[PDB]
């Protein structure tokens, strides 16, 4: 009364866990990890479904495997025990239109080839001063400038195909920033089997009594006497030499608004600095969501573990491109109810990569918010997705899906993410709207509220921004710093 | 004479064309060969079919100023000058067969990782880099991926015209600015530019053997036949490899120019840090197309061993890796790049690309058709097999439904003294920006350089030469107007 801790970490996602791991590795005693949920892991969450099949409903992949320090760490472990922690599941993308059917690897459409050109065209637009536009506006520039060297079908389907990027950002192409759109993936992705393995291993690397679940932090206060007071929901009070705040950027955002009775919101005294407050105007939050379709057994072609359905497109669009006089003129005549074919869906066929009869599919805002809201009405979900499911089975030498919630594929269960509605995540991760500069947030975050009040988390770091390993590295960064500072006695 | 231009390749021609367009009169283009075009040459074969035996593609078509200029004419008259023949590559191994877009091998995907890896690494050969990659990422590669990936990525040999052991890893990968456009044909482009300036400017079969800055501030050029010439400005566009003869004493070397004063050291030194690739071509003309037109792009992989995979897995490190490895030539000894012209052009021929050291060996026997056929017969049969046809029959002399080879054409760029190779390329330890900067600033105010080797954007490429020519002329033209 009040209990004195060396370091207090808020949030037990991967950033928080790694911070705690690092502090203990560094010999620091008497620390505490305060987590509002009843589980560790945060936006790493593995869930179980039909037949006890397991699925990562948060992050699934180790990305940038050539440099990903967290991935490398897993890999070194597997190299030593022979255990399977991940599988490389990069594959040839199957691309489907409702009408045309398969559209990938087409010797007429050559979509993947013009995609690479489209992308290289993008890279040549973004070398200082040049303003931001939506990724949509970017694709339209390309199509206009290159219409002479594109078939009508290329003009039609290419724009739909390049929108798989929506499922990497969790954002619609009209909402997505062209600048931050095309990013260099540093090597193949590795599918985690599963991520809870990663969370558990790190969780178990520090004192088990450091961990306090079901503990929502409500306020943090810098004492003029060079200490930090942390107040919890249940009236528990703590005093720390250092605090590392890892709550999602969206939750951290609640702080700069007046009304305090919001789940997750931390009251700051003195308030969060102007640089931190203003940085919120220049970075945003994506709604990447997941829907898991579990089937009795695989009754489809295992040609590929990567399937993308394209939203519908018109031949009328192609003529508008042919007939526009220039950009401004094209933007006008375009503006002159939502279904499954209204946007690109990314489907991961787990039967091929993991041997489980289930499709893990990804969706983006605004669809995600909508779909996560009705995540209780399973039959409405079935009807919504049924046309793209039947389409998929058809293009994979199978028949319509039968609602089982022979050789006909029978759906046994549907699982949906909840990241938008969960007060402790409030969306998927850091995303850029047109005009955004994520560098502002990273600089303000990595610089800290002050010497004692720090931040970590996916939204606080350049390399691996938005990714598990970025989060993981941010936590190590704050902790090694604090560890060094403390070691000076 | 206002300007004297050496070389009537695309650099020289555009330089001459640009001079006329800007109102400059009384110039002169000296060319050692009996034709214009330089390394742009279109030849005729069986049935009259035409082929670009030098350059055939407009590269970097998102930027490429010459390409845009061509497309602008085809938008004006609707006349086909090119075709986008970019396609999905079929990859063929002698033993396994087709190997592209395979669901278990995923070679193209690991190739993309390999390139990403090369990008991150930045002083060695492309071969060492690939080995370095496999050794580092072997935990994440299947056995067959280790076997076949290093063969697949050697497609890059047919870009630099250089074997992977001879090729610098630094200058190996590069980004194309978009799709390629197969030109139909380059001669159309050659003739268009050649005619855009007065034909009395042209002098053929005039080999230039000395260039001389008068201390009187003028340029004295003299030809092989003893003809003397006088000009204010001189634009030299001879290929790098020929220009490189100038740093040697011996005079009677075909093509070699005597400089007075000698080339500036920074030009002489720059030859240490860049060299020359040897891309060659072979054309295989068939009576009719009796094969699949699935792709216009086909690559055959040099042979690989499972013995090789075993070695990677067992190598404790890089030193040990070189040890195990070292520890005659055929058509399977190296990758080869075949273009199926039937799909893109309508012509029943394969245009095949080859690299040093194979190139000079095949060119040196270009006259011996039987030996050529026998040398290529195995890959050709393989190709037809993977393309739903039968073995090729030799119909090159006078005689069912099998493919009949009627003629074979081979390039000769390595034995031709006025090309002496294909285009500039990097050996390990080279740096092309030495040469490009030196050429850009010239020998003095009066002695200029143009050519594919004289410019950063489009180095080695036709549009590079074309823009280099535009630059020296557009500079010279500006100076003359000022009086
Ligand atoms: C759907 C989805 C898919 C993704 N896919 C990938 C992927 O494939 N690969 C990849 O690398 N990354 C992926 N990510 C991103 C990755 O999940 C995140 O970058 C990372 O998990 C975030 O870690 P963090 O510790 O920064 O945040 P979190 O783990 O979200 O935050 C840590 C903790 O803060 C807690 N908290 C919030 N408020 C309070 C409070 N008031 N008091 C106490 N605790 C609080 C939260 O409960 C949370 O547990 C994905 C994310 C989502 C949402
Ligand atoms: C097989 C092959 C394939 C190629 N493929 C492509 C391709 O697909 N796309 C592409 O862009 N590029 C390609 N290239 C390269 C391209 O051909 C060159 O970049 C370009 O043609 C060179 O232009 P240039 O005018 O600088 O040189 P050149 O045109 O070679 O030289 C100009 C003239 O200099 C003359 N000359 C030399 N010495 C003397 C002398 N002593 N006196 C008078 N004249 C002299 C030569 O006769 C020549 O006519 C290819 C080259 C080869 C060999």
UniProtKB/Swiss-Prot annotation, chain A:
<dbReference type="InterPro" id="IPR002937">
    <property type="entry name" value="Amino_oxidase"/>
</dbReference>
<comment type="function">
    <text>Involved in the production of beta-alanine, a precursor of pantothenic acid. Multicopy suppressor of fenpropimorph resistance.</text>
</comment>
<dbReference type="GO" id="GO:0046592">
    <property type="term" value="F:polyamine oxidase activity"/>
</dbReference>
<keyword id="KW-0285">Flavoprotein</keyword>
<dbReference type="GO" id="GO:0052897">
    <property type="term" value="F:N8-acetylspermidine:oxygen oxidoreductase (propane-1,3-diamine-forming) activity"/>
</dbReference>
<dbReference type="InterPro" id="IPR036188">
    <property type="entry name" value="FAD/NAD-bd_sf"/>
</dbReference>
<dbReference type="GO" id="GO:0016491">
    <property type="term" value="F:oxidoreductase activity"/>
</dbReference>
<dbReference type="GO" id="GO:0046208">
    <property type="term" value="P:spermine catabolic process"/>
</dbReference>
<keyword id="KW-0560">Oxidoreductase</keyword>
<dbReference type="Pfam" id="PF01593">
    <property type="entry name" value="Amino_oxidase"/>
</dbReference>
<keyword id="KW-0274">FAD</keyword>
<comment type="similarity">
    <text>Belongs to the flavin monoamine oxidase family.</text>
</comment>
<dbReference type="GO" id="GO:0005737">
    <property type="term" value="C:cytoplasm"/>
</dbReference>
<dbReference type="GO" id="GO:0052901">
    <property type="term" value="F:spermine oxidase activity"/>
</dbReference>
<protein>
    <recommendedName>
        <fullName>Polyamine oxidase FMS1</fullName>
        <ecNumber>1.5.3.17</ecNumber>
    </recommendedName>
</protein>
<dbReference type="GO" id="GO:0052903">
    <property type="term" value="F:N(1)-acetylpolyamine oxidase (3-acetamidopropanal-forming) activity"/>
</dbReference>
<dbReference type="GO" id="GO:0015940">
    <property type="term" value="P:pantothenate biosynthetic process"/>
</dbReference>
<dbReference type="InterPro" id="IPR050281">
    <property type="entry name" value="Flavin_monoamine_oxidase"/>
</dbReference>
């Amino acid at each position: 009364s009040p209990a004195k801790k060396k370091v207090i970490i808020i949030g037990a996602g991967i950033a928080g866990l790694k911070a705690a791991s690092t502090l203990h590795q560094n010999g620091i005693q008497d620390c505490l990890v305060l987590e509002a949920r009843d589980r560790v892991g945060g936006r790493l969450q593995t869930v179980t479904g039909y037949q006890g099949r397991k699925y990562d409903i948060g992050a699934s992949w180790h990305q940038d495997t050539l440099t990903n320090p967290l991935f490398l760490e897993e890999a070194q472990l597997s190299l030593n025990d022979g255990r399977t922690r991940f599988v490389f599941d990069d594959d040839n993308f199957i691309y489907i239109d409702e009408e045309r059917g398969r559209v990938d690897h087409d010797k007429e459409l050559l979509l993947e080839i013009v995609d690479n050109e489209m992308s290289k065209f993008a890279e040549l637009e973004f070398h200082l001063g040049v303003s931001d536009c939506s990724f949509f506006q970017l694709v339209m520039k390309y199509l206009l400038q290159r219409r002479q060297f594109l078939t009508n079908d290329q003009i039609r389907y290419l724009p739909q195909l390049c929108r798989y990027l929506e499922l990497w950002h969790g954002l619609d192409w009209k909402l997505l920033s062209a600048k931050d759109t095309y990013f260099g993936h540093q090597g193949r992705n590795a599918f985690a089997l599963n991520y809870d393995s990663v969370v558990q291993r790190i969780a178990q690397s520090f004192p088990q009594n450091w961990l306090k679940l079901s503990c929502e932090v409500k306020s943090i206060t810098r004492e003029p006497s060079k200490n930090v007071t942390v107040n919890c929901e249940d009236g528990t009070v703590y005093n720390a030499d250092y605090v590392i705040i890892t709550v999602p950027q969206s939750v951290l955002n609640l702080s700069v608004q007046p009304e305090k009775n919001l789940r997750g919101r931390i009251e700051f005294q003195p308030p969060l600095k102007p640089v931190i407050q203003d940085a919120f105007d220049k970075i945003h939050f994506g709604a990447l969501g997941k829907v898991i379709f579990e089937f009795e057994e695989c009754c489809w072609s295992n040609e590929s573990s990567k399937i993308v359905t394209l939203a519908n497109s018109t031949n009328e669009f192609v003529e508008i491109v042919r007939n526009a006089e220039n950009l401004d003129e094209l933007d006008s005549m375009l503006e002159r109810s939502v279904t499954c074919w209204s946007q690109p869906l990314f489907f991961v066929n787990l039967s091929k990569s993991t041997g489980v009869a289930s499709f893990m599919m990804l969706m983006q805002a605004p669809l995600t918010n909508h779909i996560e809201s009705i995540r209780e009405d399973k039959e409405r979900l079935f009807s919504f997705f049924q046309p793209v499911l039947n389409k998929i089975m058809k293009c994979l030498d199978s028949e319509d899906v039968i609602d089982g919630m022979a050789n006909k594929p029978v759906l046994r269960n549907i699982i949906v993410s909840n990241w938008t509605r969960d007060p402790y995540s409030r969306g998927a991760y850091s995303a850029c709207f047109p005009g955004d500069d994520p560098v502002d947030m990273v600089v303000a975050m990595s610089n800290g509220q002050d010497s004692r009040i720090r931040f970590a988390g996916e939204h606080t770091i350049m390399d691996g921004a938005g990714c598990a390993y970025g989060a993981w590295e941010s936590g190590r960064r704050e902790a090694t710093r604090i560890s060094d500072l403390l070691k000076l006695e």
